[PDB]
CSV table of N, CA, C and O in Angstrom, one decimal:
chain,number,residue,atom,x,y,z
A,1,UNK,N,18.3,-1.2,-10.7
A,1,UNK,CA,19.0,-1.0,-9.5
A,1,UNK,C,17.9,-0.5,-8.4
A,1,UNK,O,16.9,0.0,-8.8
A,2,UNK,N,18.3,-0.8,-7.2
A,2,UNK,CA,17.4,-0.5,-6.1
A,2,UNK,C,18.0,-0.8,-4.7
A,2,UNK,O,18.7,-1.9,-4.6
A,3,UNK,N,17.8,0.0,-3.8
A,3,UNK,CA,18.4,-0.2,-2.4
A,3,UNK,C,17.4,0.2,-1.4
A,3,UNK,O,16.4,0.9,-1.7
A,4,UNK,N,17.6,-0.2,-0.1
A,4,UNK,CA,16.8,0.1,1.0
A,4,UNK,C,16.9,1.5,1.4
A,4,UNK,O,18.0,2.0,1.6
A,5,UNK,N,15.7,2.2,1.5
A,5,UNK,CA,15.7,3.6,1.9
A,5,UNK,C,14.4,3.9,2.7
A,5,UNK,O,13.4,3.3,2.4
A,6,UNK,N,14.5,4.9,3.6
A,6,UNK,CA,13.4,5.3,4.4
A,6,UNK,C,12.7,6.5,3.7
A,6,UNK,O,13.3,7.6,3.7
A,7,UNK,N,11.5,6.3,3.3
A,7,UNK,CA,10.7,7.3,2.6
A,7,UNK,C,11.6,8.1,1.7
A,7,UNK,O,11.5,9.4,1.7
A,8,UNK,N,12.4,7.4,0.9
A,8,UNK,CA,13.3,8.1,0.0
A,8,UNK,C,12.6,9.3,-0.6
A,8,UNK,O,12.9,10.5,-0.3
A,9,UNK,N,11.7,9.1,-1.6
A,9,UNK,CA,11.0,10.1,-2.3
A,9,UNK,C,9.5,9.8,-2.4
A,9,UNK,O,9.2,8.7,-2.8
A,10,UNK,N,8.7,10.7,-2.0
A,10,UNK,CA,7.2,10.5,-2.1
A,10,UNK,C,6.8,10.5,-3.6
A,10,UNK,O,6.8,11.5,-4.2
A,11,UNK,N,6.4,9.3,-4.0
A,11,UNK,CA,6.0,9.1,-5.4
A,11,UNK,C,4.5,8.9,-5.4
A,11,UNK,O,3.9,8.7,-4.4
A,12,UNK,N,4.0,9.0,-6.6
A,12,UNK,CA,2.5,8.8,-6.8
A,12,UNK,C,2.1,7.3,-6.6
A,12,UNK,O,2.7,6.5,-7.3
A,13,UNK,N,1.2,7.1,-5.7
A,13,UNK,CA,0.8,5.8,-5.4
A,13,UNK,C,1.0,5.4,-3.9
A,13,UNK,O,0.3,4.6,-3.4
A,14,UNK,N,2.1,6.0,-3.4
A,14,UNK,CA,2.4,5.8,-2.0
A,14,UNK,C,1.2,6.0,-1.1
A,14,UNK,O,0.4,7.0,-1.3
A,15,UNK,N,1.0,5.1,-0.2
A,15,UNK,CA,-0.1,5.2,0.7
A,15,UNK,C,0.3,5.4,2.2
A,15,UNK,O,1.1,4.6,2.7
A,16,UNK,N,-0.1,6.5,2.7
A,16,UNK,CA,0.2,6.9,4.1
A,16,UNK,C,-0.9,7.7,4.7
A,16,UNK,O,-1.8,8.2,4.0
A,17,UNK,N,-1.0,7.6,6.1
A,17,UNK,CA,-2.0,8.3,6.8
A,17,UNK,C,-1.8,9.8,6.9
A,17,UNK,O,-0.9,10.3,7.5
A,18,UNK,N,-2.7,10.5,6.1
A,18,UNK,CA,-2.6,11.9,6.0
A,18,UNK,C,-3.4,12.6,7.1
A,18,UNK,O,-4.7,12.5,7.1
A,19,UNK,N,-2.8,13.2,8.1
A,19,UNK,CA,-3.5,13.8,9.2
A,19,UNK,C,-4.7,14.6,8.6
A,19,UNK,O,-4.7,15.1,7.5
A,20,UNK,N,-5.8,14.5,9.4
A,20,UNK,CA,-7.0,15.2,9.0
A,20,UNK,C,-8.0,15.4,10.2
A,20,UNK,O,-8.5,14.4,10.7
A,21,UNK,N,-8.1,16.6,10.7
A,21,UNK,CA,-8.9,16.9,11.8
A,21,UNK,C,-10.4,17.0,11.4
A,21,UNK,O,-10.8,18.0,10.7
A,22,UNK,N,-11.2,16.0,11.7
A,22,UNK,CA,-12.6,15.9,11.4
A,22,UNK,C,-13.3,17.0,12.1
A,22,UNK,O,-12.7,17.8,12.9
A,23,UNK,N,-14.6,17.1,11.9
A,23,UNK,CA,-15.5,18.1,12.5
A,23,UNK,C,-15.2,18.2,14.0
A,23,UNK,O,-14.7,19.2,14.5
A,24,UNK,N,-15.4,17.1,14.7
A,24,UNK,CA,-15.2,17.0,16.1
A,24,UNK,C,-13.8,17.7,16.4
A,24,UNK,O,-13.6,18.2,17.5
A,25,UNK,N,-12.9,17.6,15.5
A,25,UNK,CA,-11.6,18.2,15.6
A,25,UNK,C,-10.7,17.3,16.3
A,25,UNK,O,-10.0,17.6,17.3
A,26,UNK,N,-10.7,16.0,15.8
A,26,UNK,CA,-9.9,15.0,16.4
A,26,UNK,C,-8.8,14.5,15.4
A,26,UNK,O,-9.1,13.9,14.4
A,27,UNK,N,-7.6,15.0,15.7
A,27,UNK,CA,-6.5,14.6,14.8
A,27,UNK,C,-6.6,13.2,14.3
A,27,UNK,O,-6.3,12.2,15.1
A,28,UNK,N,-7.1,13.0,13.1
A,28,UNK,CA,-7.3,11.7,12.5
A,28,UNK,C,-6.0,11.3,11.7
A,28,UNK,O,-5.2,12.1,11.4
A,29,UNK,N,-6.0,10.1,11.3
A,29,UNK,CA,-4.9,9.5,10.4
A,29,UNK,C,-5.5,8.5,9.5
A,29,UNK,O,-5.2,7.3,9.5
A,30,UNK,N,-6.4,9.0,8.6
A,30,UNK,CA,-7.0,8.2,7.6
A,30,UNK,C,-6.0,7.8,6.5
A,30,UNK,O,-5.1,8.5,6.2
A,31,UNK,N,-6.3,6.6,5.8
A,31,UNK,CA,-5.4,6.2,4.8
A,31,UNK,C,-5.6,7.0,3.5
A,31,UNK,O,-6.8,7.3,3.1
A,32,UNK,N,-4.5,7.5,3.0
A,32,UNK,CA,-4.5,8.4,1.8
A,32,UNK,C,-3.5,7.9,0.8
A,32,UNK,O,-2.5,7.3,1.2
A,33,UNK,N,-3.8,8.1,-0.4
A,33,UNK,CA,-2.9,7.6,-1.5
A,33,UNK,C,-2.4,8.9,-2.3
A,33,UNK,O,-3.2,9.7,-2.6
A,34,UNK,N,-1.1,8.9,-2.5
A,34,UNK,CA,-0.5,10.0,-3.2
A,34,UNK,C,-1.0,10.0,-4.7
A,34,UNK,O,-1.1,8.9,-5.3
A,35,UNK,N,-1.2,11.1,-5.2
A,35,UNK,CA,-1.7,11.3,-6.6
A,35,UNK,C,-0.7,12.1,-7.4
A,35,UNK,O,-0.3,11.7,-8.5
A,36,UNK,N,-0.3,13.3,-6.8
A,36,UNK,CA,0.6,14.1,-7.5
A,36,UNK,C,1.4,14.9,-6.4
A,36,UNK,O,0.9,15.2,-5.3
A,37,UNK,N,2.6,15.3,-6.7
A,37,UNK,CA,3.5,16.0,-5.8
A,37,UNK,C,3.7,17.4,-6.4
A,37,UNK,O,3.4,17.7,-7.6
A,38,UNK,N,4.3,18.3,-5.6
A,38,UNK,CA,4.6,19.7,-6.0
A,38,UNK,C,5.6,20.3,-5.1
A,38,UNK,O,6.1,19.6,-4.2
A,39,UNK,N,6.0,21.5,-5.4
A,39,UNK,CA,7.0,22.2,-4.6
A,39,UNK,C,6.8,23.7,-4.8
A,39,UNK,O,6.9,24.2,-5.9
A,40,UNK,N,6.6,24.4,-3.7
A,40,UNK,CA,6.4,25.9,-3.7
A,40,UNK,C,7.4,26.5,-2.8
A,40,UNK,O,7.0,27.1,-1.7
A,41,UNK,N,8.7,26.5,-3.1
A,41,UNK,CA,9.7,27.1,-2.3
A,41,UNK,C,10.0,26.2,-1.0
A,41,UNK,O,9.9,26.7,0.1
A,42,UNK,N,10.2,24.9,-1.3
A,42,UNK,CA,10.5,24.0,-0.2
A,42,UNK,C,9.2,23.3,0.3
A,42,UNK,O,9.2,22.2,0.8
A,43,UNK,N,8.1,24.1,0.1
A,43,UNK,CA,6.8,23.6,0.5
A,43,UNK,C,6.2,22.6,-0.5
A,43,UNK,O,5.5,22.9,-1.4
A,44,UNK,N,6.6,21.3,-0.3
A,44,UNK,CA,6.2,20.3,-1.2
A,44,UNK,C,4.7,20.0,-1.0
A,44,UNK,O,4.3,19.7,0.2
A,45,UNK,N,4.0,19.9,-2.0
A,45,UNK,CA,2.6,19.6,-1.9
A,45,UNK,C,2.3,18.3,-2.5
A,45,UNK,O,2.9,17.8,-3.5
A,46,UNK,N,1.3,17.6,-1.9
A,46,UNK,CA,0.9,16.2,-2.4
A,46,UNK,C,-0.6,16.1,-2.3
A,46,UNK,O,-1.2,16.3,-1.3
A,47,UNK,N,-1.1,15.7,-3.5
A,47,UNK,CA,-2.5,15.5,-3.6
A,47,UNK,C,-2.9,14.1,-3.2
A,47,UNK,O,-2.9,13.1,-4.0
A,48,UNK,N,-3.3,13.9,-1.9
A,48,UNK,CA,-3.7,12.6,-1.4
A,48,UNK,C,-5.2,12.5,-1.4
A,48,UNK,O,-5.9,13.5,-1.4
A,49,UNK,N,-5.7,11.3,-1.5
A,49,UNK,CA,-7.1,11.0,-1.6
A,49,UNK,C,-7.5,10.0,-0.5
A,49,UNK,O,-7.0,8.8,-0.5
A,50,UNK,N,-8.3,10.5,0.5
A,50,UNK,CA,-8.7,9.6,1.6
A,50,UNK,C,-9.4,8.4,1.1
A,50,UNK,O,-10.3,8.5,0.2
A,51,UNK,N,-9.0,7.2,1.6
A,51,UNK,CA,-9.6,6.0,1.2
A,51,UNK,C,-10.3,5.3,2.4
A,51,UNK,O,-9.6,4.5,3.1
A,52,UNK,N,-11.5,5.6,2.6
A,52,UNK,CA,-12.3,5.1,3.8
A,52,UNK,C,-13.7,5.7,3.8
A,52,UNK,O,-13.9,6.8,4.3
A,53,UNK,N,-14.6,4.9,3.3
A,53,UNK,CA,-16.0,5.3,3.3
A,53,UNK,C,-16.1,6.8,2.8
A,53,UNK,O,-16.0,7.7,3.6
A,54,UNK,N,-16.4,6.9,1.5
A,54,UNK,CA,-16.5,8.3,0.9
A,54,UNK,C,-16.6,8.1,-0.6
A,54,UNK,O,-16.2,7.1,-1.2
A,55,UNK,N,-17.3,9.1,-1.2
A,55,UNK,CA,-17.5,9.1,-2.6
A,55,UNK,C,-16.2,9.6,-3.3
A,55,UNK,O,-15.7,8.9,-4.1
A,56,UNK,N,-15.8,10.8,-3.0
A,56,UNK,CA,-14.6,11.4,-3.6
A,56,UNK,C,-14.3,12.7,-3.0
A,56,UNK,O,-15.2,13.6,-2.9
A,57,UNK,N,-13.1,12.9,-2.6
A,57,UNK,CA,-12.6,14.1,-1.9
A,57,UNK,C,-11.4,14.7,-2.7
A,57,UNK,O,-11.5,15.6,-3.5
A,58,UNK,N,-10.3,14.0,-2.4
A,58,UNK,CA,-9.0,14.4,-3.1
A,58,UNK,C,-8.7,15.9,-2.7
A,58,UNK,O,-9.5,16.8,-3.0
A,59,UNK,N,-7.6,16.0,-2.0
A,59,UNK,CA,-7.1,17.4,-1.6
A,59,UNK,C,-5.6,17.4,-1.4
A,59,UNK,O,-5.0,16.3,-1.0
A,60,UNK,N,-5.0,18.5,-1.5
A,60,UNK,CA,-3.6,18.7,-1.4
A,60,UNK,C,-3.3,18.7,0.1
A,60,UNK,O,-4.1,19.1,0.9
A,61,UNK,N,-2.1,18.2,0.5
A,61,UNK,CA,-1.7,18.1,1.9
A,61,UNK,C,-0.2,18.5,2.0
A,61,UNK,O,0.4,18.9,1.0
A,62,UNK,N,0.3,18.3,3.2
A,62,UNK,CA,1.7,18.6,3.4
A,62,UNK,C,2.4,17.4,3.9
A,62,UNK,O,1.8,16.3,4.1
A,63,UNK,N,3.8,17.5,4.0
A,63,UNK,CA,4.6,16.4,4.5
A,63,UNK,C,4.3,16.1,6.0
A,63,UNK,O,4.2,15.0,6.4
A,64,UNK,N,4.1,17.2,6.7
A,64,UNK,CA,3.8,17.1,8.1
A,64,UNK,C,2.7,16.1,8.4
A,64,UNK,O,2.7,15.4,9.4
A,65,UNK,N,1.8,16.0,7.4
A,65,UNK,CA,0.7,15.1,7.5
A,65,UNK,C,1.1,13.7,7.0
A,65,UNK,O,0.5,12.7,7.4
A,66,UNK,N,2.1,13.7,6.1
A,66,UNK,CA,2.6,12.5,5.5
A,66,UNK,C,3.3,11.7,6.5
A,66,UNK,O,4.5,12.1,6.9
A,67,UNK,N,2.7,10.6,6.9
A,67,UNK,CA,3.4,9.7,7.9
A,67,UNK,C,4.1,8.6,7.2
A,67,UNK,O,3.7,7.5,7.2
A,68,UNK,N,5.3,9.0,6.6
A,68,UNK,CA,6.1,8.0,5.9
A,68,UNK,C,6.4,6.8,6.8
A,68,UNK,O,6.7,5.7,6.3
A,69,UNK,N,6.2,7.1,8.1
A,69,UNK,CA,6.5,6.0,9.1
A,69,UNK,C,5.4,4.9,8.9
A,69,UNK,O,5.5,3.9,9.6
A,70,UNK,N,4.4,5.3,8.1
A,70,UNK,CA,3.3,4.3,7.9
A,70,UNK,C,3.0,4.3,6.4
A,70,UNK,O,1.8,3.9,6.0
A,71,UNK,N,4.0,4.6,5.6
A,71,UNK,CA,3.8,4.6,4.2
A,71,UNK,C,3.7,3.1,3.7
A,71,UNK,O,4.0,2.2,4.4
A,72,UNK,N,3.2,3.0,2.5
A,72,UNK,CA,3.0,1.7,1.9
A,72,UNK,C,3.1,1.7,0.4
A,72,UNK,O,2.2,1.5,-0.4
A,73,UNK,N,4.3,2.1,0.0
A,73,UNK,CA,4.6,2.2,-1.5
A,73,UNK,C,3.9,1.1,-2.2
A,73,UNK,O,3.6,0.0,-1.7
A,74,UNK,N,3.7,1.4,-3.5
A,74,UNK,CA,3.0,0.4,-4.4
A,74,UNK,C,3.9,-0.7,-4.8
A,74,UNK,O,5.1,-0.5,-4.8
A,75,UNK,N,3.3,-1.8,-5.2
A,75,UNK,CA,4.1,-3.0,-5.6
A,75,UNK,C,4.0,-3.2,-7.1
A,75,UNK,O,3.3,-4.1,-7.6
A,76,UNK,N,4.6,-2.3,-7.8
A,76,UNK,CA,4.6,-2.3,-9.3
A,76,UNK,C,5.6,-3.3,-9.7
A,76,UNK,O,6.8,-3.4,-9.3
A,77,UNK,N,5.1,-4.2,-10.6
A,77,UNK,CA,6.0,-5.3,-11.2
A,77,UNK,C,6.5,-6.2,-10.1
A,77,UNK,O,6.7,-5.8,-9.0
A,78,UNK,N,6.6,-7.5,-10.4
A,78,UNK,CA,7.0,-8.5,-9.5
A,78,UNK,C,8.4,-8.1,-8.9
A,78,UNK,O,9.3,-7.6,-9.7
A,79,UNK,N,8.6,-8.3,-7.7
A,79,UNK,CA,9.9,-8.0,-7.0
A,79,UNK,C,10.8,-9.2,-7.0
A,79,UNK,O,10.6,-10.1,-6.2
A,80,UNK,N,11.7,-9.2,-7.9
A,80,UNK,CA,12.6,-10.3,-8.0
A,80,UNK,C,13.9,-9.9,-8.9
A,80,UNK,O,13.8,-9.1,-9.8
A,81,UNK,N,15.0,-10.5,-8.5
A,81,UNK,CA,16.3,-10.3,-9.2
A,81,UNK,C,16.3,-11.0,-10.5
A,81,UNK,O,15.3,-11.4,-11.0
A,82,UNK,N,17.5,-11.0,-11.1
A,82,UNK,CA,17.7,-11.6,-12.4
A,82,UNK,C,19.2,-11.5,-12.8
A,82,UNK,O,19.6,-10.4,-13.2
A,83,UNK,N,19.9,-12.6,-12.8
A,83,UNK,CA,21.3,-12.6,-13.1
A,83,UNK,C,21.5,-11.7,-14.4
A,83,UNK,O,21.2,-12.1,-15.5
A,84,UNK,N,22.1,-10.5,-14.1
A,84,UNK,CA,22.4,-9.6,-15.2
A,84,UNK,C,23.6,-10.0,-16.0
A,84,UNK,O,24.7,-10.1,-15.4
A,85,UNK,N,23.4,-10.2,-17.3
A,85,UNK,CA,24.4,-10.6,-18.2
A,85,UNK,C,24.8,-9.4,-19.1
A,85,UNK,O,23.9,-8.8,-19.6
A,86,UNK,N,26.1,-9.3,-19.3
A,86,UNK,CA,26.6,-8.2,-20.1
A,86,UNK,C,26.2,-6.8,-19.6
A,86,UNK,O,25.0,-6.5,-19.6
A,87,UNK,N,27.2,-6.1,-19.2
A,87,UNK,CA,26.9,-4.7,-18.6
A,87,UNK,C,28.2,-3.9,-18.7
A,87,UNK,O,28.1,-2.8,-19.3
């Protein structure tokens, strides 16, 4: 089963621009991929990893930075129906 939804639930793999103020201090929006989620009293935490010229960073972020409006969920398994028989 599956239906259309807007940023239903932030799962691991989701790719979205996680705000990040560089040195210059310019609200950036680099591509980041979800690694793990969390929750500390409503404060959901997500370990995103910037993907753009870099060795390795990986850092926890917040939803405010999570631009689901620019999310790019992963394409796990081919997306296709299949006449369900017997149910």
